[PDB]
Amino acid sequence: MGQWQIKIYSENEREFRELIERLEEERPSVQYTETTRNGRRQLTIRSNDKNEVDRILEEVRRKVPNARVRETETGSLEHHHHHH
Numbered sequence: 001m002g003q004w005q006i007k008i009y010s011e012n013e014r015e016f017r018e019l020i021e022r023l024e025e026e027r028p029s030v031q032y033t034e035t036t037r038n039g040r041r042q043l044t045i046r047s048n049d050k051n052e053v054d055r056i057l058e059e060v061r062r063k064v065p066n067a068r069v070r071e072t073e074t075g076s077l078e079h080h081h082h083h084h
Helices: 013-025 050-063
Strands: 002-009 031-037 040-047 068-075
Touching: 002 013, 002 050, 013 031, 013 040, 013 050, 040 050, 050 068
Parallel strands: none
Antiparallel strands: 002 040, 002 068, 031 040
């Protein structure tokens, strides 16, 4: 249970431009946002579907050898769940 968010950190131009184009061309269409913060650009990708996020996840690892990626699954990410 939770939305999947892929944060890509890649400094080179080819790396980001690959994913940017792919996300628009992948049927139907993938949500994303690029923002150059702290001197480096970050591609924050927001997916609705699992098979979709898996396509994006491999796409950055296969197309981009300069990929610092952390998939943050926004849903169940609370600190120490209160069982009591």
